[PDB]
């Protein structure tokens, strides 16, 4: 095998990644009054970054090493700050909003990328953008927004979760801009970029977690429920593996296959999180996910750079 017929690697890796994230973040830790929700987000991102960095280092060591990097360290730091900010904000968003909403919000990169490109790069997309984005807008309005906001979440001031989601989207857009500019101007390979940004994010996260007095403190939580020690680790590992497998898709059959695989994986994750953990999705809502995914696929198919 090894062909796109069954790319079990990425599929299983990201499936386990999503299921583990939903289990750990929204896990019903404790019983009754003695309940402690998962309020720790920096530690998880720090562990994930460390595992990704070590796997990237091993991958580069075991693969071609003739390439010599030409990028500057401060550029890596500038990318990493936004990268870690986006990851941490998105992860923290799960403490208020439901998981399907979080994944739907994190699956809306086209809007921010188009906005940043128009504002600064001034790139014009007569048909690819400004015309197919209406589908994304309609879908997101269907799911996250009510008919007139009068039934459901109500028109009251949204919780901090949606604002955190917006912050994550903005940071993701900025990170994408920085990565694209650096790649265009310095010709940096994927492995070196991932390793450097992960190392910088690891250092910053370590300093922050030590200042916040969490690592020195939160270990009592793990002690009370030692199981979380194992599960979280597994989660991180999965992410790393995905990246490695993603590299294959980059070199084999181009990136369109990887994009479509990511889209279908996101849809499958929505289905699983709505069918396994029983997070009811109101009527006239699934159509919104359908609209958003259809728009994303059409963009990835028609009018794709």
């Amino acid at each position, epitope marked *: 095998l090894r062909l796109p017929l069954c790319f079990l690697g990425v599929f299983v890796c990201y499936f386990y990644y999503g299921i583990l994230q939903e289990k750990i973040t929204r896990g019903k830790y404790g019983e009754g009054a003695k309940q402690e929700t998962f309020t720790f987000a920096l530690t998880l991102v720090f562990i994930q970054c460390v595992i990704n960095a070590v796997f990237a280092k091993i991958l580069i060591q075991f693969f071609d090493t003739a390439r010599v990097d030409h990028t500057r360290s401060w550029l890596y730091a500038a990318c990493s700050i936004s990268y870690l900010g986006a990851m941490v904000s998105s992860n923290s968003a799960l403490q208020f909003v439901n998981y399907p909403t979080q994944v739907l919000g994190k699956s809306c990169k086209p809007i921010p990328v188009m906005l940043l490109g128009v504002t600064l790069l001034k790139k014009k997309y007569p048909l690819a953008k400004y015309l197919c984005v209406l589908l994304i807008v309609a879908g997101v309005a269907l799911f996250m927004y009510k008919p007139k906001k009068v039934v459901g979440i109500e028109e009251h001031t949204v919780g901090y979760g949606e604002l955190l989601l917006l912050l994550s989207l903005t940071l993701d857009g900025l990170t994408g801009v920085s990565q694209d500019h650096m*790649r265009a*101007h*310095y010709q940096t390979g994927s492995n070196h970029m991932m390793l450097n940004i992960n190392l910088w994010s690891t250092l910053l996260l370590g300093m922050g977690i030590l200042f916040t007095g969490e690592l020195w403190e939160f270990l009592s939580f793990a002690e009370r429920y030692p199981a979380i020690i194992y599960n979280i680790l597994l989660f991180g590992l999965t992410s790393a593996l995905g990246q490695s497998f993603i590299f294959m898709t980059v070199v084999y059959f181009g990136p369109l296959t990887c994009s479509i695989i990511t889209t279908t994986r996101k849809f499958f994750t929505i289905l699983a999180s709505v069918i396994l953990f029983a997070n009811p999705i109101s009527p006239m809502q699934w159509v919104g996910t359908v609209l958003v995914f259809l728009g994303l696929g059409l963009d990835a198919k028609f009018g794709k750079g």
Partner: single-chain antibody
Amino acid sequence: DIVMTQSPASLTVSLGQSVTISCRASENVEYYGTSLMQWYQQKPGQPPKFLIYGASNIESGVPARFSGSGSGTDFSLNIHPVEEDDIAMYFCQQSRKVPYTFGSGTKLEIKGSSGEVQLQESGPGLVKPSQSLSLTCSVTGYSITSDYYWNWIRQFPGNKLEWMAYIRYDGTSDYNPSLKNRISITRDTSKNQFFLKLNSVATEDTATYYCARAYYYDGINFDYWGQGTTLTVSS
């Protein structure tokens, strides 16, 4: 490796004519939408002067007349108002892969005919084949421990350039795969020098050697050049 080709060997022009020089590559030289093409100018008996990077960006200080265009595997350098100043040989270079190469060059002639870093070369003049050789390049007004690449290049008779090797201030060094088994590059930050050592030279190394300084942006660019030292090998 890529074999750059320059079609017009030589040209004749008056003062007030548009001059366009073509350059071709055997493989695509664009990476993520950016073209890695450099254009240099060399007057007789002088080191080449860095002119254009990216095939479209004019280096600071170059007069506005010069311009570049093209993409894919075809590029062209254009000067509309040629003057007396710009009469020299123009070279096109690619930086898509490690063995950077220069074209055969095109010659243009008019019908009818402390703050700056200083680099100085030194070494032997005459040497018999089958004997190891060493050359030194000394840098003043600057420290070789800052962010800059330091390269050794050589030019054969007939003006066919061939990049030899380079070393980065971090200590990382790169060699030409053809010469990787013969030449070695070393440095010394105490006396602010760097040396190139060749093993079992032959008669084919008769050429002029330059040591240059370069910085990477849309491909390596050799901003500063030394005066160059001759080397004749014979029996």
